[PDB]
Amino acid sequence: MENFVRTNFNPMILERAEKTMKEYGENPQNEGNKFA
């Protein structure tokens, strides 16, 4: 899930992953896989 990612990843990876995902134009929950 998207939830699993929030659980046991850092601030600075969740943060960085959210940018990089937002950079492509896609929500964490829009695709839980690619976020992980």
Q: Are 4 and 29 in contact (CB under 8 A)?
A: no
Which amino acid, 32?
Answer: G
25 burial via Cβ count (<10 Å: 0-12, 13-18, 19+): exposed
User: For residues 12 and 24, what is the distance between their CA atoms, to the nearest angstrom?
Assistant: 18
* Structure tokens, 11: 């601030």
Neighbours of 12 (CB within 10 A): 8
Q: Are 29 and 6 in contact (CB under 8 A)?
A: no
User: For residues 29 and 18, what is the distance between their CA atoms, to the nearest angstrom?
Assistant: 10
User: For residues 2 and 4, what is the distance between their CA atoms, to the nearest angstrom?
Assistant: 6
Rounded (5°) CA angle 13-20-12: 15
User: For residues 21 and 32, what is the distance between their CA atoms, to the nearest angstrom?
Assistant: 11
